[PDB]
């Protein structure tokens, strides 16, 4: 979201250059891992290490600006809280992830909400399978 600066200020928070760089990286990268972010941020702040990237992501997530989702091997990837609202389908071979509108699981989630009293988004974890493509 591009209103992040006013929202944080209205809450007493400001992002230092390096924190903004990490936020930009998560924005720019799409499905970025902490290490991908490290690489991207170094193009501006070469002196940054991964522990700083780990903490900034923890902070940004807690602040509501960033969110994570798991992909292959259950590895978490970061994206802005407002983007990537859907289901990822991980292929059992092709290095490609297919994104699918979560409505495409409207009944399923409902079936779960009843038979188990379990409410799910279908977003946090990916779904592994085989793809004809």
- Per partner kind, with CB cut-offs from 5 to 8 A, the member of a copy of itself, Zn ion, Cl ion, none near residue 132 is a copy of itself
The DSSP call for residue 32 is B
Tell whether residue 121 is a contact of a copy of itself (CB under 8 A): yes
End-to-end CA, the chain: 33
Task: Closer to a copy of itself by CB, 29 or 98: give it.
Answer: 98
Q: Is 124 annotated as a binding residue?
A: no
Pick one of Zn ion, a copy of itself, Cl ion, none as the site partner of residue 84 (Cβ within 5 to 8 A by kind): Zn ion
Q: The tokens of 102 are what? A: 């979560």
Q: Taken in order 65, 70, 72, 75, is the CA torsion positive or negative?
A: positive
Token couple for 69: 């989702």
Binding site for a copy of itself (CB under 8 A): 70, 73-76, 89-91, 98, 100, 104-105, 107-108, 111-112, 115-122, 124-133
């Amino acid at each position: 979201s591009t209103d992040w600066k006013s929202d944080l200020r209205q809450r007493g928070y400001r992002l230092t250059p390096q924190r903004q760089l990490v936020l930009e990286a998560v924005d720019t990268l799409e499905h970025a891992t902490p290490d991908d972010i490290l690489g991207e941020v170094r193009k501006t702040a070469s002196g940054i290490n991964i522990s700083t990237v780990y903490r900034t992501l923890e902070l940004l997530e807690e602040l509501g600006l960033v969110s994570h989702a798991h992909l292959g091997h259950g590895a978490p990837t970061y994206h802005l809280a407002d983007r990537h609202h859907h289901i990822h389908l991980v292929c059992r071979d092709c290095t490609n992830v297919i994104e699918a509108d979560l409505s495409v699981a409207a009944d399923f989630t409902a079936k779960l909400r009843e038979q188990f009293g379990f409410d799910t988004d279908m977003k946090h974890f990916a779904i592994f399978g085989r793809c004809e493509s």
